[PDB]
Enzyme design. Structure first.
Site, mmCIF file in Angstrom:
data_model
loop_
_atom_site.group_PDB
_atom_site.id
_atom_site.type_symbol
_atom_site.label_atom_id
_atom_site.label_comp_id
_atom_site.label_asym_id
_atom_site.label_seq_id
_atom_site.Cartn_x
_atom_site.Cartn_y
_atom_site.Cartn_z
ATOM 1 N N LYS A 258 0.806 -1.216 0.000
ATOM 2 C CA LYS A 258 0.000 0.000 0.000
ATOM 3 C C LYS A 258 0.841 1.269 0.000
ATOM 4 O O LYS A 258 0.526 2.214 -0.729
ATOM 5 C CB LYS A 258 -0.933 0.016 1.216
ATOM 6 C CG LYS A 258 -1.883 -1.169 1.285
ATOM 7 C CD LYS A 258 -2.616 -1.219 2.617
ATOM 8 C CE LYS A 258 -1.746 -1.812 3.713
ATOM 9 N NZ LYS A 258 -1.665 -3.295 3.618
ATOM 10 N N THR A 259 1.906 1.313 0.803
ATOM 11 C CA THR A 259 2.739 2.510 0.859
ATOM 12 C C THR A 259 3.391 2.791 -0.490
ATOM 13 O O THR A 259 3.468 3.948 -0.921
ATOM 14 C CB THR A 259 3.805 2.357 1.944
ATOM 15 O OG1 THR A 259 3.174 2.249 3.226
ATOM 16 C CG2 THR A 259 4.745 3.553 1.946
ATOM 17 N N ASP B 93 1.119 7.160 6.094
ATOM 18 C CA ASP B 93 1.160 5.710 6.039
ATOM 19 C C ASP B 93 1.245 5.140 7.448
ATOM 20 O O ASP B 93 1.779 5.769 8.366
ATOM 21 C CB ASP B 93 2.349 5.219 5.202
ATOM 22 C CG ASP B 93 3.675 5.402 5.911
ATOM 23 O OD1 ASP B 93 3.862 6.452 6.562
ATOM 24 O OD2 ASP B 93 4.531 4.497 5.819
ATOM 25 N N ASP B 94 0.708 3.931 7.608
ATOM 26 C CA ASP B 94 0.672 3.252 8.901
ATOM 27 C C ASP B 94 -0.055 4.116 9.934
ATOM 28 O O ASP B 94 0.511 4.553 10.938
ATOM 29 C CB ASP B 94 2.088 2.891 9.365
ATOM 30 C CG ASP B 94 2.461 1.456 9.043
ATOM 31 O OD1 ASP B 94 1.585 0.570 9.145
ATOM 32 O OD2 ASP B 94 3.634 1.213 8.690
ATOM 33 N N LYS C 218 -10.882 18.066 8.339
ATOM 34 C CA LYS C 218 -12.041 18.838 7.907
ATOM 35 C C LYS C 218 -11.780 20.338 7.999
ATOM 36 O O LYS C 218 -12.704 21.117 8.257
ATOM 37 C CB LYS C 218 -13.282 18.480 8.728
ATOM 38 C CG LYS C 218 -13.697 17.022 8.623
ATOM 39 C CD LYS C 218 -14.873 16.711 9.538
ATOM 40 C CE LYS C 218 -14.439 16.562 10.989
ATOM 41 N NZ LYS C 218 -15.076 15.386 11.643
ATOM 42 N N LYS D 135 4.966 -9.034 -0.921
ATOM 43 C CA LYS D 135 6.199 -8.966 -0.142
ATOM 44 C C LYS D 135 6.562 -10.333 0.423
ATOM 45 O O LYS D 135 7.726 -10.754 0.362
ATOM 46 C CB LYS D 135 6.048 -7.940 0.980
ATOM 47 C CG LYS D 135 7.359 -7.525 1.624
ATOM 48 C CD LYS D 135 7.144 -6.426 2.652
ATOM 49 C CE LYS D 135 8.447 -6.030 3.326
ATOM 50 N NZ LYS D 135 8.215 -5.218 4.552
HETATM 51 N N1 LIG Z 1 2.718 -3.743 -8.014
HETATM 52 C C1 LIG Z 1 3.248 -3.592 -6.797
HETATM 53 N N2 LIG Z 1 2.478 -3.063 -5.821
HETATM 54 C C2 LIG Z 1 3.000 -2.910 -4.601
HETATM 55 N N3 LIG Z 1 4.227 -3.214 -4.173
HETATM 56 C C3 LIG Z 1 4.967 -3.734 -5.157
HETATM 57 C C4 LIG Z 1 4.568 -3.954 -6.465
HETATM 58 N N4 LIG Z 1 5.600 -4.510 -7.207
HETATM 59 C C5 LIG Z 1 6.582 -4.611 -6.344
HETATM 60 N N5 LIG Z 1 6.271 -4.161 -5.087
HETATM 61 C C6 LIG Z 1 7.146 -4.145 -3.921
HETATM 62 O O1 LIG Z 1 6.323 -4.292 -2.793
HETATM 63 C C7 LIG Z 1 7.078 -3.779 -1.688
HETATM 64 C C8 LIG Z 1 6.094 -3.505 -0.580
HETATM 65 O O2 LIG Z 1 6.536 -2.353 0.165
HETATM 66 P P1 LIG Z 1 6.007 -2.067 1.625
HETATM 67 O O3 LIG Z 1 6.794 -2.800 2.638
HETATM 68 O O4 LIG Z 1 5.946 -0.553 1.826
HETATM 69 O O5 LIG Z 1 4.504 -2.588 1.571
HETATM 70 P P2 LIG Z 1 3.144 -2.288 2.341
HETATM 71 O O6 LIG Z 1 2.153 -3.386 1.958
HETATM 72 O O7 LIG Z 1 2.683 -0.902 2.120
HETATM 73 O O8 LIG Z 1 3.566 -2.538 3.854
HETATM 74 P P3 LIG Z 1 3.075 -3.350 5.141
HETATM 75 O O9 LIG Z 1 3.092 -4.816 4.874
HETATM 76 O O10 LIG Z 1 4.033 -2.917 6.256
HETATM 77 O O11 LIG Z 1 1.679 -2.795 5.436
HETATM 78 C C9 LIG Z 1 7.639 -2.478 -2.250
HETATM 79 O O12 LIG Z 1 8.952 -2.370 -1.716
HETATM 80 C C10 LIG Z 1 7.823 -2.781 -3.748
HETATM 81 O O13 LIG Z 1 9.207 -3.049 -3.924
#
Ligand SMILES: Nc1ncnc2c1ncn2[C@@H]1O[C@H](COP(=O)(O)OP(=O)(O)OP(=O)(O)O)[C@@H](O)[C@H]1O
Ligand SMILES: Nc1ncnc2c1ncn2[C@@H]1O[C@H](COP(=O)(O)OP(=O)(O)OP(=O)(O)O)[C@@H](O)[C@H]1O
Ligand SMILES: Nc1ncnc2c1ncn2[C@@H]1O[C@H](COP(=O)(O)OP(=O)(O)OP(=O)(O)O)[C@@H](O)[C@H]1O
Ligand SMILES: Nc1ncnc2c1ncn2[C@@H]1O[C@H](COP(=O)(O)OP(=O)(O)OP(=O)(O)O)[C@@H](O)[C@H]1O
EC number: 3.6.4.6
Lengths: 534, 40, 31, 514, 83
Positions: free
Chosen positions: D323-324, D377-378, D405, D482
């Site tokens: 998501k981030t 985020d978070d 708001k 991930k």
């Molecule tokens: N299409 C995609 N969408 C999202 N992330 C992607 C994609 N392709 C590759 N990634 C990888 O996914 C990794 C996820 O990053 P991050 O740890 O910020 O995820 P998050 O889901 O936002 O976090 P968390 O699990 O802590 O909530 C990013 O580092 C990126 O390298």
């Protein structure tokens, strides 16, 4: 020329300051190499500032005096501490002006071919202090600073003076002055390495080898490897202490001071004296890297079954994965098991098996009675320290005791939990890696808080379950005879057992306090009483 | 307990009170000799 | 050192006062 | 002569020369006041002196007075105030001679903070204040000062009618700094001591927070390196002595000397965003395209909206769904003048008050622009939350609800993006109503998507891929991206033959369903 | 021949009532050298600027003079810092 013919790297006896000395020479004497024609053709100014700073026991004074000796010109002027301040008013400025007056007059008389003069300042921070940050008592300090600033670079400019100053607290110096034209070059001095330690030890042991006063059992490489984090002063002190210990072996005291007068030429220094001096007389002062493993591992490790080997292989595999990977610079695992199972010892052993440059262990033992905010600051400082190195491993033991958890209510600390959760997924800076290994004894509690999911994977650490493991452990300990072992087996084979290694050791040591006729029965009774478990 | 002790810098010796004092008296010798001769 | 110089200056001032007094007395007698 | 202050130049003109054009008779009869207080502060350099001279030159006044630092101060007492009366004696004489229409006197101070900020300091300040404004009236006094600590000035000078102009100094630009380098290097250019292969244009363009001191220092370092090229030191104090006839300095040596000798002093800021994206973004399915399209639509609505100057969106999805990264990519693609990211990482151990202050400061900074986007985020980690109790900080929640708001100043836009992984918790706290809408981010559902992602990664060959597809195609999968990368990396450790079995076992163990 | 330098520093510490000032006195009396100097606490501080440093420097004048005059073959000067 301006350089004495006797200049030589060996003659100054400096240690592992090759790069620093090379940079100093390059950036402070290069312009003096070509003849006047070329330098005049360039039409560029010269360097007028040098400042050496660093922690104590580095060699700033030695380097300064060696540089002064190397220069071939009028005897450099030396200021020995803050002796410029005087009581009758107007004397500090008089002395500071009198310091440069000779150079000013000589340069004025000689025109553009005047010689080079350099002044050696000792304890520079004593005299110059930040003008803004200072009390309003009297200004014998602001006036001196202003006069020095005017003299170094005022309306009239000079190109035959170089300021060299040695200090220990660089932040105390005034910032308004450390600008180009007055103090441009500034270097940082740290701690030597094994190569520098070897070179320094050779420098200080030259005479004995020249006269063959050292026995063949001396190994410079082994000594250098043994001493870690030491400094030049510490090495010199260790050598002197070893020499004194070796020399003391021909003195009779407490009745009359006497010496042989005939065995004095039979003096020699052995290795055992060196280790004795290193372990009893000298102790490192600059920080430390003695991650005491005897405290955590008080009885070594004994292979009593597959689980130990499996855990060791899993740890080695994890270490290899973190070392030889880049897509996941951060990797961590969790070690968990029933109480009294030796989780901390296994974690420490796994950490030690790795050869990471920086290894540290954070345990609650150090934080006894600490407030609810000091713990977070300590953890932040530890994690900041572990960020500097390229590779690092951190072990967090007794997690349940790091949160103040208690099953009544239940109660715990939210701030520490949040800090640990945040610090457990912050990736390190670019081009670095880190490893985190945790310990705990309550998986369900961590699951409830939703913190077990953060960890990448977990490893189980079971305890003795079968009698044959108990017999193997007893054989390894060797605390019983064949008849007693057979008697114990004839009972333990009846059913199963469940007891941790630490509890087993405590039980056997308690049972060993009775007479031989009753030791076996007492041990069996204790095992039966404590063996009430699934 | 906000308070602080103080340090002192004497000035009772002026290096400029030796020039004029000595130059001033150096000129009365001739006058004293002249008046002594006149009285004799 | 400096105290001796100050004492010498004070003695010179005293000598100047004595010289002025002698001048005044001498002129008074001469009148 | 000076850029970036045309409107500020007009403002200064109105402030200063508005009351001077009128003849003294009419202004005296009416009773209007005069402006005679100016103060300056900014990065050290020639900009301050340039501005002072530009202001002074236009007025038909005599030579201004300039003092370099605490020149008035002396070893003894009475010297500091000796010059003050002498300087204004001529001004008083002119005032008493020419009357109202007396020749203007201009005073310029350099580093006056040294004397104005222990009887010397307060006595000097009182004397200066009396001379500038006191019982005696002086209609021909102009004062300008430059200090790096304007807030430390005494309270007396802050009285109304004494300090009426507040201004800030400019910063070096590309063309001006290029001219400075040109004047410095004209000597070498005439002497042909600089190689023709060095380009000053891009070198000046890339410079950030470099002043004249930094420029001369790096130039001197380059000259020293050029001197060393011919030298054969580090072994002796003897050199070739022949190559000196031919000498030139390549731009590579310039960069090497200036990149490891000196660094900018007045801070250093950058917009590094790669830290939040370590492996880019790979299109493994359709949903990412829909998310990007929705983000672009929201951005274009915010940019082109007139009735709703403020718009907010919420990103939702299961954990380890990426998501981030998507939010950061959308923010970067938005291409707005000001972009910022607020994360809990920067605040570790901070109490509620510190977090609230940081959030308020960041929002205030974002407000001053014309249009910007802010991403949080978070959210749960931002306002510490624990299922037990439950427990959380009420102050942070109230601050967020208030800031979600509040409209910005009229004529400006703003965009807010939030990411979270707990919809139910936010709904119970009554926060999900504030957000305008929500978006979803699903995980890998069908084995075909997993195979496509693996092929895009290119970590396995056809033989293993066929077996993997045959084994997994006849079943549904639910894995996070991930976690998928972590599992792939873990399986890659073993030998090429046992990778398939270990990977399949790990996937089966990690398998789960909604 | 060994080219070694002698130690010129000793520090003693411990709880009150064990024999530090007895050991120091006995050591000072043992050596067949000049009478040792003694400093009783912060007795060197003064009121006029730049007098404490002069007092500290006056302690080592004799040792420096002896070193300069008699070179290596010189006596031993003892200084006892109390508190
Ligand atoms: N299409 C995609 N969408 C999202 N992330 C992607 C994609 N392709 C590759 N990634 C990888 O996914 C990794 C996820 O990053 P991050 O740890 O910020 O995820 P998050 O889901 O936002 O976090 P968390 O699990 O802590 O909530 C990013 O580092 C990126 O390298
Ligand atoms: N790299 C080194 N090579 C040789 N000797 C060294 C080195 N580092 C320290 N020493 C030893 O340090 C001793 C004292 O050095 P020095 O007088 O420069 O200390 P220092 O750094 O000035 O101490 P401080 O910072 O407390 O003033 C010398 O006897 C020297 O042998
Ligand atoms: N193979 C082994 N594995 C673990 N510990 C062992 C082993 N062999 C012997 N020991 C002993 O087990 C002791 C257990 O140490 P320790 O008290 O730190 O255990 P722990 O399980 O980490 O602690 P606790 O469960 O009490 O919180 C160690 O001191 C070590 O001497
Ligand atoms: N080992 C000892 N043998 C004999 N007398 C001792 C011993 N230790 C202490 N004393 C007694 O100590 C007395 C002197 O006090 P002492 O110098 O020991 O105190 P101190 O250590 O200087 O105390 P403080 O900490 O207050 O400075 C003598 O009367 C002596 O008898």
């Amino acid at each position: 020329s301006i350089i004495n013919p006797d200049w030589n790297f060996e003659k100054m006896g400096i240690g592992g300051l090759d790069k620093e000395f090379s940079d100093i020479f390059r950036r402070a004497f290069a312009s003096r190499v070509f003849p006047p024609e070329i330098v005049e053709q360039m039409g560029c100014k010269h360097v007028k500032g040098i400042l050496l700073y660093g922690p104590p026991g580095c060699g700033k004074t030695l380097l300064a005096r060696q540089i002064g000796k190397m220069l071939n010109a009028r005897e450099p002027k030396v200021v020995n501490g803050p002796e410029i301040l005087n009581k009758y008013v107007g004397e500090s400025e008089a002395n500071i002006r009198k310091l440069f007056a000779d150079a000013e007059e000589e340069q004025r008389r000689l025109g553009a071919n005047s010689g080079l003069h350099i002044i050696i300042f000792d304890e520079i921070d004593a005299i110059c202090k930040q003008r803004g940050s200072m009390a309003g008592s009297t200004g014998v300090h602001d006036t001196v600073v202003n006069q020095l600033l005017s003299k170094i670079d005022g309306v009239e400019q000079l190109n035959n003076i170089l300021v060299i100053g040695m200090t220990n607290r660089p932040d105390l110096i005034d910032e308004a002055l450390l600008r180009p034209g007055r103090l441009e070059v500034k270097m940082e001095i740290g701690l030597p390495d094994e190569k520098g330690r070897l070179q320094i030890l050779h420098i200080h042991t030259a005479r004995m080898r020249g006269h063959q006063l050292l026995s063949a059992d001396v190994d410079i490489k082994e000594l250098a490897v043994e001493t870690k984090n030491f400094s030049g002063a510490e090495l010199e002190g260790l050598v002197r202490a070893a020499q004194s210990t070796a020399m003391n072996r021909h003195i009779k005291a407490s009745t009359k001071v006497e010496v042989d007068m005939e065995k004095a030429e039979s003096l020699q220094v052995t290795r055992g004296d060196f280790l004795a001096s290193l372990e009893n007389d000298i102790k490192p002062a600059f920080g430390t890297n003695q991650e005491d493993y005897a405290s955590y591992i008080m009885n070594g490790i004994i292979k009593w079954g597959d689980p130990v080997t499996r855990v060791l292989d899993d740890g080695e595999l994890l270490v290899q994965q973190t070392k030889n990977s880049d897509r996941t610079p951060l990797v961590s695992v969790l070690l968990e098991g029933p109480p009294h199972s030796g989780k901390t010892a296994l974690a420490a052993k796994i950490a030690e098996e790795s050869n990471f440059p920086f290894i540290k262990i954070c345990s609650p033992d150090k934080m006894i009675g600490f407030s609810e905010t000091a713990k977070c600051q300590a953890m932040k400082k530890i994690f900041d320290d572990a960020y500097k190195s390229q590779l690092s491993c951190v072990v967090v033991d007794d997690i349940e005791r790091l949160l103040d958890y208690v099953p009544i209510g239940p109660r715990f600390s939210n701030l520490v939990l949040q800090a640990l959760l945040v610090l457990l997924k912050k990736a390190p800076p670019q081009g670095r890696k880190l490893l985190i290994i945790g310990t705990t004894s309550r998986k369900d509690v961590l699951q409830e808080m939703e913190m077990l999911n953060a960890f990448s994977t977990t490893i189980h650490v079971p305890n003795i379950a079968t009698g044959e493991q108990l017999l193997e452990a007893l054989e390894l300990l060797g605390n019983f005879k064949d008849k007693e072992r057979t008697t114990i087996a004839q009972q333990v084979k009846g059913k199963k057992v469940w007891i941790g290694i630490k509890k087993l050791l405590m039980l056997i040591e308690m049972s060993l306090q009775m007479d031989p006729e009753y030791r076996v029965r007492k041990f069996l009774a204790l095992l039966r009483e404590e063996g009430a478990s699934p | 307990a906000i308070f602080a002790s103080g340090i002192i810098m004497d000035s009772s010796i002026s290096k400029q009170a030796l020039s004029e004092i000595e130059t001033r008296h150096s000129e009365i010798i001739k006058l004293e000799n002249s008046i002594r001769e006149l009285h004799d | 050192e400096l105290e001796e110089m100050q004492r010498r200056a004070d003695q010179l001032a005293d000598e100047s006062l004595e010289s002025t007094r002698r001048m005044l007395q001498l002129v008074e007698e001469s009148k």
